[PDB]
Amino acid sequence: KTIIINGVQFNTDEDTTILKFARDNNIDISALCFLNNCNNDINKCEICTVEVEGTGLVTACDTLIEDGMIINTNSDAVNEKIKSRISQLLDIHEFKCGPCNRRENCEFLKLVIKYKARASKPFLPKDKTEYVDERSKSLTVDRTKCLLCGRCVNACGKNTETYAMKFLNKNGKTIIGAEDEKCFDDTNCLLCGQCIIACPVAALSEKSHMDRVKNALNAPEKHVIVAMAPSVRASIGELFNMGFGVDVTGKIYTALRQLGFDKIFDINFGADMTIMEEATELVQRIENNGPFPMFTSCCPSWVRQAENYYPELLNNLSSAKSPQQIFGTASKTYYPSISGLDPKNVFTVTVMPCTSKKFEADRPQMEKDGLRDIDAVITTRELAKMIKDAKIPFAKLEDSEADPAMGEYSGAGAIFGATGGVMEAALRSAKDFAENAELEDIEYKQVRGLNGIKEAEVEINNNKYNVAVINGASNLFKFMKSGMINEKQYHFIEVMACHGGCVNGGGQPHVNPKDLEKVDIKKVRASVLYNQDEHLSKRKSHENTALVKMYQNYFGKPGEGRAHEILHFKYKKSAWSHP
Ligand code: 402
Ligand code: SF4
Ligand code: SF4
Ligand code: SF4
Ligand code: SF4
Ligand code: FES
Ligand SMILES: [Mg+2]
Ligand SMILES: [Mg+2]
């Protein structure tokens, strides 16, 4: 094919869109509703308008190049059309960036600036409460910001195949929302937040826990523990202009101390606890020749997916609490026992790359003797805002260490945040446990990486077992619906709702679509975690020194007795009932 773009001739056999071809050849075309190789098929945004000679104005993002095409991306007519489209979006947009939570990295603001667009009549809503939905424990909607670009609907479809985010006709006007405009929690929604990650503006956000945290910090009698997820240390630096793939663990510890938290622990300690219990459970299932398979239970969006779509699997879920909840349970029991704190005065905060962790922490039964396992969960983004609001110079902070008693972690815990990390971590301990050995070969590269469904054969005590790693909620559906679960007997299956694992969770820093094409965000964030594992002295969860002391002095033997009494949680399908 011979293509001419802005007077430049190209000769190509590529079969692709104008947008993709132009961008591959360093020709600027704007886009808004195009993302994840999809645009908004109904009511296209047309920000990607170009002019094709003999045809007129076309959308570059969904028009294939054809031989003989003569294209102009920057004519007066093209720019007036794009400016008009942005102007019409401003007409439905509460354009007040000052207090907006996307002020620093908004895609729409960049387009408004680029085209110098202005509303025909400013959109100034008197009563915002009609536009805002904060009922969810995890998600919130601010429709005064919504561009009806469809990126959340497309992302939910692709990431989960639930189509829990939908277009709705609300009193004659188009909105996005959950089925029948219900609270997301009351629908089949997984609360994974991939819709937030896809949103170009501040229309979708996490349910704020910021006030819970500040009120607890300011309460004289509260002793506030903070502990961050594996993924936070591989990601939060993005929001401080430090680039991608930067390990900022020590700076986080320092910032949390400067924020006034009273104890600095780490959820990777809870990850090692989860492995203690789950690898022990796997060995008991092996020794009892069932029940198989056992599924991980640490991703609360996967738990919701099982509850909503596969309730017959709930009995197969590991009973070990997630790293967050298992840490939290220990923070109200073991921690007072080594500190003198009144358990009622301990307030446990986690920092997560995840929105469904808020739903998990707020599950009614996730408590004991009136004490919540976890009192507040803030996302990576929320912690970034806290640090900036306190004027803490994050990129310049010196490194500090965590408090050790619930803060040490092994390399197995460190890799939890990548798809296959829980699998690899659990196998390192289950094989030692079952063979009564301290084995040297601990790297299970077969379960790593971005393939959507991964499987491997492992040898445990001179028998062979089959494991699988499901990498993304849509791939859970593919694995089940395609019958893949029945090609062989699976014994242990890891499921994460977010493709790439928690490093790509719904509470993570937004990345604009341009950077997403230069940077493999899922692999670059996960690289921080595998690097920590490679350089840590202890690379198995049962070699964590602070954890071994806690089990010896307080919990006893994992998987039974006291440990099973309080560190476990079982989900039950609803009993049969009609209708
Ligand atoms: N609880 C828990 Fe996890 C741990 O450890 C996180 O904190 Fe994850 C991350 N990063 C998140 O969110 S949840 C799913 N298992 C893998 S990692
Ligand atoms: S969503 Fe973007 S354009 Fe709209 S108010 Fe917030 S920062 Fe400004
Ligand atoms: S939270 Fe996940 S499942 Fe729910 S609407 Fe958003 S993308 Fe879909
Ligand atoms: S919520 Fe965000 S992604 Fe969804 S349609 Fe509105 S602006 Fe687009
Ligand atoms: S994969 Fe991690 S970040 Fe994503 S929903 Fe599950 S627990 Fe949350
Ligand atoms: S970016 Fe092409 S129609 Fe929206
Ligand atoms: Mg399309
Ligand atoms: Mg305080």
The 3-class SS string of 132-176 reads: EECCCCCEEEECCCCCCCCHHHHHHHHHHCCCCCEEEEECCEEEE
End-to-end CA distance of the chain: 61
In DSSP terms, which residues pair with 349 in a beta bridge? Answer: 226, 376
Continuous H helices in 390-453: 411-414, 421-435
**Residues 332/308, Cβ–Cβ less than 8 Å:** no
Taking the C-alpha atoms of residue 269 and residue 373, their distance in angstroms, rounded to an integer, is 15
Whole-Å CA distances, 387 to 53, 220, 383, 390, 510:
52, 21, 6, 5, 17
Token pair 């307030």 is found at 347
CA 440 to mean position of chain CA atoms: 32
Domain ranges of the chain: 1-123, 124-207, 208-579
Ligand 5 centroid–CA 1 distance in Å is: 45
| Residue 59 DSSP SS3 | strand
Q: Identify the burial level of 248 via C-beta atoms within 10 angstroms of its C-beta, where 0-12 means exposed, 13-18 middle and 19 or more buried.
A: buried
**Residues 286/465, Cβ–Cβ less than 8 Å:** yes
Q: Which residues touch 337 (CB under 8 Å, ≥6 apart)?
A: 554
Q: Which residues define the annotated binding site for [2Fe-2S] cluster?
A: 33, 45, 48, 61
In terms of residues, how long is the chain? 579
Breaks (C-N over 2.5 A) in the chain follow: none
**Residues 353/228, Cβ–Cβ less than 8 Å:** no
**Residues 310/292, Cβ–Cβ less than 8 Å:** no
107-126 in b/e form (b: 16+ CB < 10 A) is bbbebbeebebebeeeeeee
Determine if ligand 2 sits within 6 Å of the CB of residue 86.
no
Q: Which residues define the annotated binding site for [4Fe-4S] cluster?
A: 93, 97, 100, 106, 146, 149, 152, 156, 189, 192, 195, 199, 299, 354, 498, 502
**Residues 439/459, Cβ–Cβ less than 8 Å:** no
**Residues 355/381, Cβ–Cβ less than 8 Å:** no
CA 135 to mean position of chain CA atoms: 20
Continuous H helices in 490-544: 513-518, 521-535
Structure tokens at 271: 């990850």
Q: Which residues define the annotated binding site?
A: 33, 45, 48, 61, 93, 97, 100, 106, 146, 149, 152, 156, 189, 192, 195, 199, 299, 354, 498, 502
Structure tokens at 217: 């910090």
Whole-Å CA distances, 577 to 426, 573, 574:
37, 12, 8
Give ligand 4 pocket residues (Cβ under 6 A): 146-152, 176, 198-201, 203-204
Whole-Å CA distances, 431 to 411, 419, 464:
16, 20, 12
Question: Which run of H or E residues covers position 243?
Answer: none
Taking the C-alpha atoms of residue 265 and residue 270, their distance in angstroms, rounded to an integer, is 10
CA-closest candidate to residue 526, choices 494, 500, 558: 500
Structure tokens at 552: 């010896």
CA 516 to mean position of chain CA atoms: 16
| Residue 350 DSSP SS3 | strand
CA-closest candidate to residue 571, choices 268, 250, 325: 325
What residue's CA is closest to ligand 1, atom 5?
A: 271
In ligand 1, the atom with minimum distance to the C-alpha of 232 is 10
> At how many Å resolution was this determined?
1.6
Taking the C-alpha atoms of residue 55 and residue 573, their distance in angstroms, rounded to an integer, is 58
